[PDB]
Amino acid sequence: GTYEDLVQAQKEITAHNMQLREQTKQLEHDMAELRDQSQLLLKARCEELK
Amino acid sequence: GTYEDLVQAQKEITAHNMQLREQTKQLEHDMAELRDQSQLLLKARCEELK
Amino acid sequence: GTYEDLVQAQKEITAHNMQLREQTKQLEHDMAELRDQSQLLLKARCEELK
Amino acid sequence: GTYEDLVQAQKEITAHNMQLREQTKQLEHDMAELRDQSQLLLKARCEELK
Amino acid sequence: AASIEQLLERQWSEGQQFLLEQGTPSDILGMLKSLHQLQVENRRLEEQIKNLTAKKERLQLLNAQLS
Amino acid sequence: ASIEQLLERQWSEGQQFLLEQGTPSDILGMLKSLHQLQVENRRLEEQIKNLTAKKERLQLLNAQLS
Amino acid sequence: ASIEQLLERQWSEGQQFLLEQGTPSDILGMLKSLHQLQVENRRLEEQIKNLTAKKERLQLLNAQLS
Amino acid sequence: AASIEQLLERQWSEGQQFLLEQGTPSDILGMLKSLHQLQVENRRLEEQIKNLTAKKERLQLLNAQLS
Ligand SMILES: [Zn+2]
Ligand SMILES: [Zn+2]
Ligand SMILES: [Zn+2]
Ligand SMILES: [Zn+2]
Ligand SMILES: [Zn+2]
Ligand SMILES: [Zn+2]
Ligand SMILES: [Zn+2]
Ligand SMILES: [Zn+2]
Ligand SMILES: [Zn+2]
Ligand SMILES: [Zn+2]
Ligand SMILES: [Zn+2]
Ligand SMILES: [Zn+2]
Ligand SMILES: [Zn+2]
Ligand SMILES: [Zn+2]
Ligand SMILES: [Zn+2]
Ligand SMILES: [Zn+2]
């Protein structure tokens, strides 16, 4: 019934949340790595102007 | 994403509703068995009273 | 006559067999309900033993 | 099951028998009436030869 | 077998002999036997109906000719 | 064997006898259809008998346990 | 009011809001399909709830009578 | 309402106010509330994913240009 339905919904919503969190952690990590490269490469361009 | 979430919800509720149509028939049968049993047990208790 | 008797027998057994295919499914469900109930009642009797 | 099937078969075979008996009684009566007419009409033809 | 009637009667005997040997209750056997006998009587009646129906029609024609 | 083997043998007998008799093929085709129905019925009757018997044993058991 | 009337009113609100928002019609058509499924589900859930409750009362009764 | 988020939050309040008034058990309400909050967090995450995915692709292009 509706109780078992709520338990099932909880399970699915919670699994979805776990997956979204993992994906978000990886994306933040990807972004951090890419921004490091951006800062390194910008600094090299600035040095070439001097 | 939110699009894919909606497609999945549609499938799940569609499947759940078909399970409930089948379960309705099962429960109707469960009731016929139970009422038949009730009548038999009542008759036997009435016999012991004499 | 004997021809008409045979046509009628064919119809009756055809109908009866379709009832038995449906009844098989009902009885399968009856069994699942019963075994579930058995397990519950056994567990409760085991609890009273302590 | 097969017991209830035999009861049902008995009912149908017995009803069939009752119907066949009624039909046979009426047919015998029809034949008796028609043979009376045959004997009457034959006798009249024989009388016309004399 | 001489005839269908004799074949059915033989086939019934075989079946009764089988059920008795496998051990079927007296009531069930007694039920099956009265069924068998009604089926035998019913086929006899079906036949007689067919015969009486044809005879009736021949008498109708005979009577019209004699009138 | 058994009930089923005896009924197949009797069907085999009857079918031969009627063929020797010149029985019209529409009647024979109908008898063949009926034979199939009766064999099918036996399998279904046995399923039902076995399930029925188990159902009644379980009802009894559950009445004792409750 | 009841659960069903509140959910229809909320559906009516949401649907209007999204239309004002310019929401693509395929998403709106999907939401409309989901709404129908959820209304259908409620009717089926209530049938099931009522039958379930009666089944459990009958099982109890039959355990007392046996 | 300002946004879908505010509308959903309002619609949830209405629903909680309704269930409380019809008299729903504390546990069921507590279950529904954590569900609601997970759904709110999930939509926030879905959005952030969409945004981070686009940003990542722009950084890939930026980095190739700066090299
Ligand atoms: Zn449900
Ligand atoms: Zn890494
Ligand atoms: Zn999502
Ligand atoms: Zn059930
Ligand atoms: Zn007949
Ligand atoms: Zn049943
Ligand atoms: Zn049967
Ligand atoms: Zn008369
Ligand atoms: Zn004959
Ligand atoms: Zn005989
Ligand atoms: Zn065969
Ligand atoms: Zn078998
Ligand atoms: Zn609606
Ligand atoms: Zn309703
Ligand atoms: Zn947003
Ligand atoms: Zn909230």
Side-chain angles (χ1 to χ4, degrees), chain A residues 1-18 20-21 23-24 26-38 41-42 44-49, chain B residues 1-9 12-21 23-24 26-38 40-42 44-47 49-50, chain C residues 1-9 12-21 23-24 26-38 40-42 44-47 49-50, chain D residues 1-18 20-21 23-24 26-38 41-42 44-49, chain E residues 1-3 5 7-15 18-21 23-25 27 29-32 34-40 42 45-49 51-54 56 58-67, chain F residues 1-2 6-8 10-11 13-15 17-18 21-25 29-31 34-48 50-59 61-66, chain G residues 1-2 6-8 10-11 13-15 17-18 21-25 29-31 34-48 50-59 61-66, chain H residues 1-3 5 7-15 18-21 23-25 27 29-32 34-40 42 45-49 51-54 56 58-67:
Chain A
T2 52
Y3 178 74
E4 290 74 31
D5 291 345
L6 290 177
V7 170
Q8 179 60 34
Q10 184 168 61
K11 179 174 173 300
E12 292 176 25
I13 291 166
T14 305
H16 191 52
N17 183 258
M18 188 177 312
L20 295 170
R21 280 166 185 275
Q23 195 178 343
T24 297
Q26 178 62 41
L27 275 169
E28 284 168 9
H29 174 72
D30 294 331
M31 286 294 291
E33 295 295 324
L34 295 165
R35 286 193 298 267
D36 283 334
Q37 230 48 56
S38 291
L41 296 172
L42 177 58
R45 289 286 185 152
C46 305
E47 287 291 325
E48 287 166 11
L49 297 176
Chain B
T2 54
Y3 182 85
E4 289 68 16
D5 292 352
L6 293 179
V7 175
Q8 185 61 33
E12 287 184 22
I13 301 169
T14 302
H16 194 67
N17 289 350
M18 220 50 94
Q19 299 183 315
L20 302 172
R21 294 188 193 88
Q23 192 183 12
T24 291
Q26 294 170 334
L27 280 162
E28 292 170 345
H29 187 75
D30 292 326
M31 232 69 64
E33 288 279 355
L34 288 163
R35 285 191 296 93
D36 186 71
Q37 188 187 38
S38 292
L40 285 167
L41 297 166
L42 181 64
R45 292 279 204 174
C46 299
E47 287 302 318
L49 282 183
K50 68 224 210 193
Chain C
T2 54
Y3 182 85
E4 289 68 16
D5 292 352
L6 293 179
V7 175
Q8 185 61 33
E12 287 184 22
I13 301 169
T14 302
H16 194 67
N17 289 350
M18 220 50 94
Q19 299 183 315
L20 302 172
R21 294 188 193 88
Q23 192 183 12
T24 291
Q26 294 170 334
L27 280 162
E28 292 170 345
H29 187 75
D30 292 326
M31 232 69 64
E33 288 279 355
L34 288 163
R35 285 191 296 93
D36 186 71
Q37 188 187 38
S38 292
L40 285 167
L41 297 166
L42 181 64
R45 292 279 204 174
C46 299
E47 287 302 318
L49 282 183
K50 68 224 210 193
Chain D
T2 52
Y3 178 74
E4 290 74 31
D5 291 345
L6 290 177
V7 170
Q8 179 60 34
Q10 184 168 61
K11 179 174 173 300
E12 292 176 25
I13 291 166
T14 305
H16 191 52
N17 183 258
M18 188 177 312
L20 295 170
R21 280 166 185 275
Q23 195 178 343
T24 297
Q26 178 62 41
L27 275 169
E28 284 168 9
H29 174 72
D30 294 331
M31 286 294 291
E33 295 295 324
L34 295 165
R35 286 193 298 267
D36 283 334
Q37 230 48 56
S38 291
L41 296 172
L42 177 58
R45 289 286 185 152
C46 305
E47 287 291 325
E48 287 166 11
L49 297 176
Chain E
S3 61
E5 292 85 5
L7 181 56
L8 294 180
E9 200 64 16
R10 175 159 69 59
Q11 285 192 346
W12 157 256
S13 289
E14 291 175 358
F18 179 91
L19 292 175
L20 204 46
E21 288 196 276
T24 313
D27 286 323
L29 294 172
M31 186 145 44
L32 286 149
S34 48
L35 297 198
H36 159 75
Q37 292 186 310
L38 284 164
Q39 287 167 316
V40 169
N42 288 350
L45 291 174
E46 295 278 19
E47 264 304 295
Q48 181 168 53
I49 283 164
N51 292 339
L52 292 170
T53 304
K56 170 171 83 160
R58 293 190 302 263
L59 290 182
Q60 290 274 20
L61 296 166
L62 178 66
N63 294 352
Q65 297 258 41
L66 295 168
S67 69
Chain F
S2 82
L6 173 52
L7 301 172
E8 283 292 320
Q10 290 186 340
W11 164 243
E13 283 172 43
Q15 192 191 357
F17 180 81
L18 294 172
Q21 284 260 276
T23 303
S25 49
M30 214 106 44
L31 293 170
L34 195 71
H35 171 69
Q36 188 286 326
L37 290 163
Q38 289 161 330
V39 175
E40 185 101 358
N41 177 253
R42 286 186 279 275
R43 176 189 84 242
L44 293 163
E45 295 282 354
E46 184 182 345
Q47 294 196 325
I48 295 294
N50 293 336
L51 292 167
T52 303
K54 184 179 187 176
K55 170 191 162 206
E56 295 175 338
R57 294 188 306 264
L58 290 178
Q59 292 176 314
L61 165 70
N62 288 354
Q64 291 159 322
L65 294 177
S66 60
Chain G
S2 82
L6 173 52
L7 301 172
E8 283 292 320
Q10 290 186 340
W11 164 243
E13 283 172 43
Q15 192 191 357
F17 180 81
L18 294 172
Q21 284 260 276
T23 303
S25 49
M30 214 106 44
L31 293 170
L34 195 71
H35 171 69
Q36 188 286 326
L37 290 163
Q38 289 161 330
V39 175
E40 185 101 358
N41 177 253
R42 286 186 279 275
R43 176 189 84 242
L44 293 163
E45 295 282 354
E46 184 182 345
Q47 294 196 325
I48 295 294
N50 293 336
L51 292 167
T52 303
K54 184 179 187 176
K55 170 191 162 206
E56 295 175 338
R57 294 188 306 264
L58 290 178
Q59 292 176 314
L61 165 70
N62 288 354
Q64 291 159 322
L65 294 177
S66 60
Chain H
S3 61
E5 292 85 5
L7 181 56
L8 294 180
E9 200 64 16
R10 175 159 69 59
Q11 285 192 346
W12 157 256
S13 289
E14 291 175 358
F18 179 91
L19 292 175
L20 204 46
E21 288 196 276
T24 313
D27 286 323
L29 294 172
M31 186 145 44
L32 286 149
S34 48
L35 297 198
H36 159 75
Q37 292 186 310
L38 284 164
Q39 287 167 316
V40 169
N42 288 350
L45 291 174
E46 295 278 19
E47 264 304 295
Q48 181 168 53
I49 283 164
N51 292 339
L52 292 170
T53 304
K56 170 171 83 160
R58 293 190 302 263
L59 290 182
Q60 290 274 20
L61 296 166
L62 178 66
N63 294 352
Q65 297 258 41
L66 295 168
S67 69

mmCIF file of all heavy atoms in Angstrom, chain F residues 4 7-9 11-12 15 32 35-36 39 42, ligand 11, unseen atoms left out:
data_model
loop_
_atom_site.group_PDB
_atom_site.id
_atom_site.type_symbol
_atom_site.label_atom_id
_atom_site.label_comp_id
_atom_site.label_asym_id
_atom_site.label_seq_id
_atom_site.Cartn_x
_atom_site.Cartn_y
_atom_site.Cartn_z
ATOM 1 N N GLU F 4 -4.769 -43.083 -18.507
ATOM 2 C CA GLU F 4 -4.495 -42.347 -19.749
ATOM 3 C C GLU F 4 -4.177 -43.299 -20.896
ATOM 4 O O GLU F 4 -4.612 -43.050 -22.020
ATOM 5 C CB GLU F 4 -3.351 -41.321 -19.557
ATOM 6 N N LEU F 7 -7.463 -45.221 -22.020
ATOM 7 C CA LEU F 7 -8.245 -44.291 -22.844
ATOM 8 C C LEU F 7 -7.597 -44.030 -24.226
ATOM 9 O O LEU F 7 -8.318 -43.981 -25.215
ATOM 10 C CB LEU F 7 -8.531 -42.988 -22.088
ATOM 11 C CG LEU F 7 -9.316 -43.137 -20.750
ATOM 12 C CD1 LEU F 7 -9.380 -41.807 -20.000
ATOM 13 C CD2 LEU F 7 -10.710 -43.740 -20.922
ATOM 14 N N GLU F 8 -6.265 -43.923 -24.336
ATOM 15 C CA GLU F 8 -5.661 -43.854 -25.682
ATOM 16 C C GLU F 8 -5.905 -45.138 -26.485
ATOM 17 O O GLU F 8 -6.164 -45.081 -27.692
ATOM 18 C CB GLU F 8 -4.146 -43.556 -25.671
ATOM 19 C CG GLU F 8 -3.792 -42.112 -25.394
ATOM 20 C CD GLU F 8 -4.170 -41.107 -26.484
ATOM 21 O OE1 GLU F 8 -4.048 -41.355 -27.673
ATOM 22 O OE2 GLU F 8 -4.548 -39.989 -26.145
ATOM 23 N N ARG F 9 -5.802 -46.295 -25.838
ATOM 24 C CA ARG F 9 -5.971 -47.562 -26.559
ATOM 25 C C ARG F 9 -7.425 -47.701 -27.074
ATOM 26 O O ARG F 9 -7.648 -48.075 -28.232
ATOM 27 C CB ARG F 9 -5.614 -48.728 -25.653
ATOM 28 N N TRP F 11 -9.609 -45.177 -27.593
ATOM 29 C CA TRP F 11 -9.713 -44.233 -28.707
ATOM 30 C C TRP F 11 -9.157 -44.855 -30.000
ATOM 31 O O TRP F 11 -9.827 -44.819 -31.021
ATOM 32 C CB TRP F 11 -9.019 -42.894 -28.390
ATOM 33 C CG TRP F 11 -8.756 -42.048 -29.595
ATOM 34 C CD1 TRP F 11 -7.542 -41.672 -30.075
ATOM 35 C CD2 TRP F 11 -9.724 -41.514 -30.481
ATOM 36 N NE1 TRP F 11 -7.692 -40.904 -31.204
ATOM 37 C CE2 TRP F 11 -9.026 -40.798 -31.484
ATOM 38 C CE3 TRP F 11 -11.120 -41.579 -30.539
ATOM 39 C CZ2 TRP F 11 -9.672 -40.156 -32.545
ATOM 40 C CZ3 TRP F 11 -11.781 -40.927 -31.596
ATOM 41 C CH2 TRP F 11 -11.049 -40.224 -32.591
ATOM 42 N N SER F 12 -7.948 -45.425 -29.944
ATOM 43 C CA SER F 12 -7.348 -46.123 -31.104
ATOM 44 C C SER F 12 -8.259 -47.241 -31.677
ATOM 45 O O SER F 12 -8.403 -47.327 -32.900
ATOM 46 C CB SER F 12 -5.932 -46.673 -30.785
ATOM 47 N N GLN F 15 -11.678 -45.555 -33.209
ATOM 48 C CA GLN F 15 -11.317 -44.837 -34.431
ATOM 49 C C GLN F 15 -11.128 -45.819 -35.604
ATOM 50 O O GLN F 15 -11.613 -45.572 -36.710
ATOM 51 C CB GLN F 15 -10.040 -44.049 -34.129
ATOM 52 C CG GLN F 15 -9.541 -42.988 -35.081
ATOM 53 C CD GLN F 15 -8.109 -42.556 -34.691
ATOM 54 O OE1 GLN F 15 -7.546 -43.027 -33.686
ATOM 55 N NE2 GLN F 15 -7.517 -41.673 -35.484
ATOM 56 N N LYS F 32 -12.133 -36.789 -33.211
ATOM 57 C CA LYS F 32 -10.724 -36.509 -33.012
ATOM 58 C C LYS F 32 -10.536 -35.220 -32.173
ATOM 59 O O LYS F 32 -9.660 -35.172 -31.313
ATOM 60 C CB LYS F 32 -9.998 -36.427 -34.356
ATOM 61 C CG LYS F 32 -8.475 -36.221 -34.278
ATOM 62 C CD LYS F 32 -7.801 -36.103 -35.660
ATOM 63 N N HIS F 35 -11.462 -36.057 -28.521
ATOM 64 C CA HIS F 35 -10.376 -36.817 -27.923
ATOM 65 C C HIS F 35 -9.281 -35.877 -27.441
ATOM 66 O O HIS F 35 -8.832 -36.013 -26.311
ATOM 67 C CB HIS F 35 -9.792 -37.889 -28.869
ATOM 68 C CG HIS F 35 -8.534 -38.543 -28.345
ATOM 69 N ND1 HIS F 35 -8.522 -39.392 -27.259
ATOM 70 C CD2 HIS F 35 -7.247 -38.443 -28.753
ATOM 71 C CE1 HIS F 35 -7.285 -39.784 -27.018
ATOM 72 N NE2 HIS F 35 -6.497 -39.246 -27.931
ATOM 73 N N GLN F 36 -8.868 -34.921 -28.271
ATOM 74 C CA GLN F 36 -7.801 -33.966 -27.900
ATOM 75 C C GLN F 36 -8.242 -33.133 -26.658
ATOM 76 O O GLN F 36 -7.495 -33.001 -25.672
ATOM 77 C CB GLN F 36 -7.429 -33.077 -29.096
ATOM 78 C CG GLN F 36 -6.195 -32.165 -28.921
ATOM 79 C CD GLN F 36 -6.437 -30.931 -27.997
ATOM 80 O OE1 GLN F 36 -7.529 -30.342 -27.951
ATOM 81 N NE2 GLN F 36 -5.415 -30.574 -27.233
ATOM 82 N N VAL F 39 -8.011 -35.318 -23.532
ATOM 83 C CA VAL F 39 -6.632 -35.508 -23.085
ATOM 84 C C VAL F 39 -6.110 -34.225 -22.409
ATOM 85 O O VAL F 39 -5.493 -34.262 -21.325
ATOM 86 C CB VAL F 39 -5.717 -36.021 -24.234
ATOM 87 C CG1 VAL F 39 -4.248 -36.105 -23.797
ATOM 88 C CG2 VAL F 39 -6.199 -37.403 -24.665
ATOM 89 N N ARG F 42 -7.665 -33.896 -19.008
ATOM 90 C CA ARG F 42 -7.041 -34.705 -17.959
ATOM 91 C C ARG F 42 -5.820 -34.047 -17.352
ATOM 92 O O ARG F 42 -5.644 -34.136 -16.159
ATOM 93 C CB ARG F 42 -6.689 -36.135 -18.462
ATOM 94 C CG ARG F 42 -8.000 -36.923 -18.578
ATOM 95 C CD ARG F 42 -7.862 -38.395 -18.912
ATOM 96 N NE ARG F 42 -7.651 -38.664 -20.340
ATOM 97 C CZ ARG F 42 -8.607 -38.778 -21.270
ATOM 98 N NH1 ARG F 42 -9.901 -38.607 -20.981
ATOM 99 N NH2 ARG F 42 -8.263 -39.097 -22.518
HETATM 100 ZN ZN ZN I 11 -4.558 -39.415 -28.117
#
